[PDB]
RNA sequence: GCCCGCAUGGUGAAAUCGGUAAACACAUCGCACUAAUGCGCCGCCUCUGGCUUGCCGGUUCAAGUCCGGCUGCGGGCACCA
């Protein structure tokens, strides 16, 4: 009988008009910043988002009721591959597709009653965001954090773009699922390697992150310890430093072998063999038979001072150490050759390092971050290339460099490179005719710092230091573990960079990270367009209302565990919510007779009122603590316990205790089921919005009732329980316990040695052996 | 190979600190008012008693919880030198 199809909207408008969710930095309440991973604008809102975002809203609504000044914002991850591929697949320009998805997602969110501070909305594709990011790019470029280099990068032949190492998963492209290849090409990078030590060591301080996410990052960065041994070439200047962990076996080396892509290859079957390995996909390059080619030349071991053969082999992987190995048949080198140690490593490197012929080596798996993409739909790189002057920043006056409106979908090079009038630019140094950078920034550049932009999303400065340093770091960040070595690496990296450059005074973006579980279909399969099992949230919200949808997702299981979604699944929550409504409509006489919004000690005329009052106080405490640690399902169980309590014992309760309990019940329920809660609050005669009511606090007079159920152990084993008055003297407790028949029986041939009494919790009697 | 996480009834699961294991729901069954609603049973056994949080131990007055070792599942990095 709650008409959600008109009433949800009615309450949403009430909350809007009171500005409940508008973040005000000049508010005096203690600051709280809760956010969730902002969505790609690749389609409509899906049920998984609803789960992810419901959790943030529930928390935010509670923290608002508790007096915090809460920033809970939302915006749109709208550039790069995801939006762009979805727009291509549909047949529309990505600007038009993106805007439609924004508009659809924002509408779905508002209809769910999600309480975002919309004044803080942003979209990474808007000119205002582009201006900010281009400024940030040019700052990082001036300080040497961003640089151009002509080196090996991953290439996705189906996306037709370069990809970052983090966007290569199981040798495949992040979005295409196509085998990735490696090309040498001039590209833009960020020097994340130079921060790799801080990224790795500062994991120890992130106690609010899951140890799983932390360990996944530890392995991604992949710091290794070993030794570099320099190997001189005969009729030549420069050496080739090999890398090993088994330095101990240095004199044991029968050979040296190189990576096909190594700088120093400075002829028939060499350049033929190499280009044959270098043509292989990243997948193929790791598997199959081992191969190689004798260089011809030879090279020296400066311990032994004695000559060694040089080779070029496929089993040397280019992304580990120096790309030179140092072989001994280590059964990698044994298959190749057919075609008592620790303090030894100490003294060896002493000899080598003191006579400049080797050293201690720290290596990282982490590759520097490729950000340039040969794609239309991303942030232009604000660089002009001049045949005279080289790479030149666009002047701040010219910012932002916006995309041309028309996209050219066929031709050579990158899509922007085909647009001759867009590409034409004056060199800002000499004034000659020059060319814009033809590439765009990867989507993970946008999302690496967006959380620092929400506090003033239309400012001509990228980041408002003074606002940010008050509202951030974010207290709570909610999103999927799939970002563990994408956005959660990059965001930590860019936070440190911006810290060091003065934008902010904190070094880590997110205090507490929570990873919501997957929402799957009823059979446990990932939802996807290709399986035709994508839930439409609007259909479910239309049938059941927003509250029932959100409470099913929150009550179904632990926050971090998978849900197998059923479209009829919210029916049981809807039924629970109607049972709450009926408890109000049954007691409406009593409600309209008392203004009580909670229970006072003077309202309790007996032991039954005090049992009720007590249960409510526990429920306040438990709901409060559980929301803040994301135990939403246990919080909702506590409210259902109260609800059962009131069905069972209400009506024997004094009217005032019952009106207070019911009003208290709806106050606790509000963060979970906000619309129905406003309805019931109003129906009970309140004029205010419950969403604006201070959150309940434990009345410490009502927390213990008159009697306590105390379990009794003997030697740690539960025997029975005993009900006693609260504040019984410890000697009277013991004397009462020793009098229980079960206890008198079990001690009739045994001596009492000790007891452990934990007040109002337990008594364990420590007893000797059978006489 | 190297690193990490997890394990509780038919089912989803609960349990700040070590303190009555299974709260709260879903399913089936039963009861009361002719579907709705209210309400009840609902881990096991050789059942007056006694067990039970995958397995074996340790710590402690006390272990689902802490420590050690297994087994099983999940995840991460790797022709990783
Ligand atoms: C910060 C930025 C790099 C994020 C990036 N723009 C992005 O990932 N956008 S997004 O739309 O794919 O995801 C948004 C949020 O929604 C979660 N989610 C998605 N599907 C499900 C699901 N089936 N079940 C549970 N959660 C889901 C997902 O994990 C994430 O936190
Ligand atoms: Mn293995
Ligand atoms: Zn010039």
Residue numbers in the entry: 2 to 267, 276 to 338, 341 to 350, 386 to 817
Paper excerpt:
To prevent cell suicide, A. radiobacter K84 contains a second, non-essential LeuRS, termed AgnB2, which is resistant to TM84. The aminoacylation of tRNALeu is catalysed in a two-step mechanism in all LeuRSs: in the tRNA-independent first step, leucine is activated by ATP to form the essential obligate intermediate leucyl-adenylate (Leu-AMP) that is stably bound to the enzyme. In the second step, a bound tRNALeu repositions its CCA 3′-end into the LeuRS active site where activated-leucine is transferred to the tRNA. TM84 (agrocin 84) is a highly potent LeuRS toxin that employs a unique tRNA-dependent inhibition mechanism.
We obtained an X-ray crystal structure of AgnB2 in complex with tRNALeu and Leu-AMS; the final model was refined to a final R-factor of 19.4% (R-free=23.8%) and a final resolution of 2.1 Å. Our structure shows that Leu-AMS is bound in the active site with the mobile KQSKS loop present in a semi-open conformation. The equivalent position in AgnB2, Q573, forms a hydrogen bond side-chain interaction with the side chain of T581, which is found to be a conserved hydrophobic residue in TM84 sensitive LeuRSs (I628 in LeuRSEc). Importantly, the presence of A102 in AgnB2, instead of an asparagine as found in the LeuRSEc structure (N104), leads to loss of an H-bond interaction between the α-helix (96–114) and a main-chain peptide bond located at T42 (P45 LeuRSEc). The missing LS-domain in AgnB2 is replaced by a small connecting loop that contains a salt bridge between residues D567 and R571. Importantly, the AgnB2 structure shows the equivalent residue to R418 in LeuRSEc is the neutrally charged Q413.
